[PDB]
TrEMBL record, chain A:
NAD(+) binds at Y134, Q195, N218. Its EC number is 1.1.1.23. GO terms for molecular function: histidinol dehydrogenase activity; NAD binding; zinc ion binding. It comes from the Bacteria. Belongs to the histidinol dehydrogenase family. This is Histidinol dehydrogenase. The lineage of its organism: Bacteria, Pseudomonadati, Pseudomonadota, Gammaproteobacteria, Pseudomonadales. Its cofactor is Zn(2+).
Length: 420, 438
């Protein structure tokens, strides 16, 4: 044999050393991935479509004579919507309505405000022209990620939402494609990895250059986004798939085991960690892991993730549990404790938080629905009246002259009215 | 020998390439400036404090034996406050009042909301632990930048606001340090360039690793900020110093020439361009420039920048003026026209906009942030993720009731099972409750 999950104890004097290592895992080195991503980016900029096709065959195991075989018509998204089940389609449509209604209320357009002295301030707001959405291929690709990125882009007025979704060995995810259909994706290319990000950032003969790339992605996508920042807007660099469970010991150990498995099954570099002051509970979770793992469809992925990056960590009390959690700074925190609002203040470095025994971290990947700002460009506007320029100019005049910026000062002074 | 501003005319058939070269020529390469930056970052990541002191001696020309001589105590900020004149201190205090008022109105905190089924949703809002503020050295450092960044950080509750400001040959801008005192800066290091950015992004023995780096910067700072992206939060990376003025010819030509000088006096590489359909006007601006330039206090820097990147550009009409403006794509646009809101629909690539004849682009550098709205009580009503939001972290929370977990769990089960992610499914299914189960 049974699988034995790694065990750490913060009562060990050397516990900080093992925790550091657990948090700095170089499966494939940063440097190796970085060089590979840099080379692919430069390759896509130099050779365009030909490079995209060549990398797609190599990394996605796909046969494609040309870039035209890597274009999915929007009609294929409509077909996907007919192919999923009644219950799947209803879940997606219900979540879409809630996401879309929410963003309609939050949208803020151009505005102007007139001060008492006549000065007008405000912002001129324009949708981005195009936005690119990365969608991981295959089964481990949450449809919520499509809905929650494409819908606010369309609500903002983005004319073209371009989706890139690799098809590993030709595999297509109909639920994901159906979500893309509901969310209003305009164009789809079956490409992935660093080459998809590069094609979106710089453009090729067939892939349009977009103004912002959004979405999740593994280390190749994250590294490519880091490197095309500047050339294109980027929402964020999502970190590796991750869950920290903190438990007081009074949650069912099968539930906790499964909560760890939920993240570990996403991909082989996911990290799942449990922290608890309850030693007997940690033993129960270790047994649950050993028993439940061979019953999992994705046991191979789950085992590899837990061998490389998982751990159960014993701590002394609530205070130490929070200190270790804050150090881990988890992107996803499950506070499986009696009074979660009592633990959160001591874990300010955590990302998304799932509270209590009844809130599985997995619900965060399949959110049923409740932004636009991130798909808009803003120009700030100042239109002083003569009186407003006098008020502002008096302050600027003094400060500028103080540091010898006399063109700044005289520029402002030309519009200062003399007082009564 | 009166100065003759460079003249361009869109009617010329070499205009596209002539303007292309004016907009793109570079002294040092991208690769060499970028290569020097990549080297400096690796050096301070490796040699820590020693690299910072070495780069500071070489590039700033400072006689500093160790990192402890590059630390300015908070008292030195208070002393700056007493060294500036009364009118300068009050001007800093007035500016800080307007900034601080605005950010207080914008500040949002944590919240919770209980759904009908008992599920609690919300957000936990906390300040960043530490923020790092880059402040240019010398006289060309806007005190605005200190106020505009340190004040929202303190209003957010950032417990340690760290400022870096190079002091070339020991020169100190007392107004800038006084601004830092008023804005509540906690610690100051007299360092700059890429090495300052890297010391803040990664931390050294004496410089603390901060959660976000903000502020303006020259090419080395901007390049360094681009490279430490993903390693540490950053704000918008400011581009090179630049102004495009578009005028219909109905603005006093001296005002326009001085608006060009305002940007030109910042540094030798600054780019100041005027576009107009009014040919007689453009001549009056050329004369204004010749007459006004000699006695500018920074006449030599203005002349250098106008020679290298300045231009007066003749166009056929308003539409061609806007086409040229769109090709330049200015981060700072001065629409010095009678009807500025009529020109804006045809301006599609522009950052911050100064409208009409009474709005000098100089006011941008002293009363607003980079492409930020002017802070007033009225403008505070319009939300922005800039400002106090910059320096805060937001954690979404969900606390399902048993019934909420059941409703959400069924939908999670359907979609996760549809994708064969059965750990997701079973984890959600464990919480589904059926009252009739004994
Ligand atoms: N040629 C260079 N190589 C490396 N760093 C440089 C070079 N020129 C300037 N720097 C860095 O940029 C800083 C210049 O001071 P700063 O005020 O921030 O920019 P500026 O004065 O041009 O506006 C220096 O501290 C220095 O570290």
């Amino acid at each position: 044999a049974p699988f034995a999950i790694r065990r750490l104890n913060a009562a060990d004097p050397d516990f900080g050393r093992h925790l550091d290592h657990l948090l700095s895992w170089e499966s494939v080195s940063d440097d190796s991935v970085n060089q590979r991503v840099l080379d692919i980016i430069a390759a896509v900029r130099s050779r365009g479509d030909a490079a995209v096709v060549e990398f797609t065959q190599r990394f996605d195991g796909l046969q494609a004579a040309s870039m035209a075989d890597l274009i999915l018509p929007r009609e294929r998204l409509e077909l996907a919507l007919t192919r999923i089940t009644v219950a799947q389609r209803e879940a997606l449509e219900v979540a879409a309505e809630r996401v879309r209604s929410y963003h309609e209320k939050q949208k803020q357009g151009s505005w102007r405000y007139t001060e008492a002295d006549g000065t007008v301030l405000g912002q001129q707001v324009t949708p981005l022209d195009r936005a690119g959405l990365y969608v991981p291929g295959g089964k481990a690709s949450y449809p919520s990620s499509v809905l929650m990125n494409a819908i606010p882009a369309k609500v903002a007025g983005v004319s073209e939402v371009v989706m890139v979704v690799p098809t590993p060995r030709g595999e297509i995810n109909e639920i994901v494609l159906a979500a893309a259909c509901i969310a209003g994706v305009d164009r789809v290319f079956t490409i992935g990895g660093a080459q998809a990000v590069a094609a979106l950032a710089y453009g090729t003969e067939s892939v349009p250059r977009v103004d912002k790339i959004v979405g999740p992605g593994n280390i190749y996508v994250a590294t490519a986004k880091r490197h095309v920042f500047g050339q294109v807007g980027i929402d964020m660099i999502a970190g590796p798939s991750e869950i920290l469970v903190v438990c007081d010991g009074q949650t069912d150990p099968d539930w906790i085991a499964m909560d760890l498995f939920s993240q570990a099954e996403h991909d082989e570099d996911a990290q799942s960690i449990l922290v608890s002051p309850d030693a007997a509970f940690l033993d129960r979770v270790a047994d649950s892991i050993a028993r439940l793992l061979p019953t999992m469809e994705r046991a191979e992925i789950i085992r590899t993730s837990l061998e490389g990056r998982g751990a159960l960590i014993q701590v002394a009390d609530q205070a130490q549990a929070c200190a270790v959690a804050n150090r881990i700074a988890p992107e996803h925190l499950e506070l499986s404790v009696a009074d979660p609002e009592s633990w959160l203040p001591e874990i300010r470095h955590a990302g998304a938080i799932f509270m209590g025994r009844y809130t599985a971290e997995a619900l965060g990947d399949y959110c049923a629905g409740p932004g636009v700002y991130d798909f808009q460009k803003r120009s700030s506007i100042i239109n002083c009246s003569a009186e407003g320029a006098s008020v502002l100019g008096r302050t600027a005049s003094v400060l500028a002259r103080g540091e010898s910026l006399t063109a700044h000062a005289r520029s402002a002074e030309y519009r200062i009215l003399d007082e009564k």
